[PDB]
Symmetry: C2
């Protein structure tokens, strides 16, 4: 597909016309993870799908200062270049979901809806309430290609079978291969927004939907559940046998629920 | 096909062979509400599907005393007769999901799994945390048949369209026509289990999945979110634009999640 680059040096794909969806991928991943996942699903066709590479990931340059504040500013700049003041839908995974929240919180009137998978809500890892990873070993797998990533797959994915390994290689490996680890490490020294507590308390005035796994040792599920009651339009799906690579563990659930979420907005 | 009756005077359907699924319906409904919904939306094929009419509802006789404790007792008798000691899966809607919880608590070693839609957790209506009901008026409906039932459809369902009205007529009205209002009215005076608090604190040691709706004014969602708090195998689906007739508002979602649940257990 055709890769574009904003003047703010954010690499992205843009496909389709109609209401924009801005997809923000997880930490160490890239737009392959989002693009390859959502393009196959029946009802994103009517939308303009915009898959960004975060700074220091994919084909997007690292940025100085290497802080979450600068990431947010750069992504806001980027979105304006791409769609201007047109109203948009947000999708976010992991740190992508943290930034999705920050954007929704700052561009309240321009945001139509937010859908998050395994989102970061507390940036500081030492503060997070996390779950316990496990494996459900469904099938024997004999890896040929990408053998060197197999442990990370096993350490991250919950449901272990051939399709999950194929998905990991297709969606996760590309980002791992491009991530700027030094940039990420520096970012993590200035990772938490000063308004993080506001994100934890805000009652968004549009659909706000979260999918979390019981076995997600990176961001867990508790803190996300706590966002739900006070969010008037807050939805949650929390599932067993599901971890941080929730979109592989529960491929079909994410497709189903993303579609159901678009239905909400369509109404 | 065939309708069955236990020695305990519980009316039921039982379809297929295999691991048993015991389906419990909501208050005032009957086993048409469960049977007609799940049999078509089915990855239920490899299971034995058992759809019970609760006492005083459907074609199951009322009981004395008319208390939830005794409703539970009757149901335990019924299950033991129908499946003995076989391990089983539980489905419960609303009052049926309250009973389901009780059953799983009582038959903890036999219960493989519990799937609940809009479950009663606190029986006492005056103590429940509930949502605000709304309608999403998608189409005009000009009812011809069952016009006298239309108010309660509007009052309960959230998503209002013609399909929702057809489903309501096929799923909810048969139970309405059969319910023993006198039993139910009496049952509602001894509605809490004597052990009710123990249900609110159990950490079930098998998958325990709940679907709830933001706009459910009957049982809400908050108490159910809190159960997921202390359940290590707790799952929850909480959706907007959804009320107490969740199987009608979110028909696809229920079949999807119930299939997923079965897979979880398999
Ligand atoms: Cl490339
Ligand atoms: Cl009485």
């Amino acid at each position: 597909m055709k890769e574009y680059l904003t003047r703010s040096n954010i690499s992205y794909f843009s496909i389709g016309s109609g209401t924009p969806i801005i997809f923000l991928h997880g930490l160490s991943l890239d737009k392959q993870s989002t693009c390859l996942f959502f393009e196959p699903l029946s009802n994103v066709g009517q939308y303009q799908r915009i898959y960004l590479d975060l700074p220091g990931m994919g084909n997007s340059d690292p940025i100085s200062p290497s802080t979450s504040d600068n990431v947010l500013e750069t992504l806001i700049e980027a979105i304006e270049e791409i769609i201007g003041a047109r109203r948009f839908i947000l999708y976010g995974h992991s740190y992508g979901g943290y930034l999705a929240q920050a954007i929704a919180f700052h561009l309240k009137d321009q945001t139509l809806g937010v859908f998050l998978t395994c989102p970061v809500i507390t940036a500081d890892h030492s503060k997070r309430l996390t779950g316990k990873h496990i494996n459900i070993l469904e099938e024997d797998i004999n890896p040929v290609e990408n053998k060197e990533y197999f442990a990370d797959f096993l350490s991250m994915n919950v449901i272990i079978n051939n399709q999950a390994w194929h998905d990991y290689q297709n969606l996760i490996i590309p980002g791992l291969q491009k991530e700027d680890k030094t940039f990420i490490d520096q970012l993590q020294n200035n990772y938490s927004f000063t308004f993080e507590e506001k994100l934890k308390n805000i009652n968004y005035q549009f659909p706000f939907k979260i999918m979390v796994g019981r076995n997600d040792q990176v961001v867990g599920y508790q803190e996300q559940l706590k966002l739900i009651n006070h969010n008037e339009n807050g939805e949650i799906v929390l599932l067993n046998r599901t971890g941080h690579n929730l979109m592989i563990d529960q491929r079909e659930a994410v497709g189903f629920h993303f579609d159901l979420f678009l239905d909400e907005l369509n109404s």
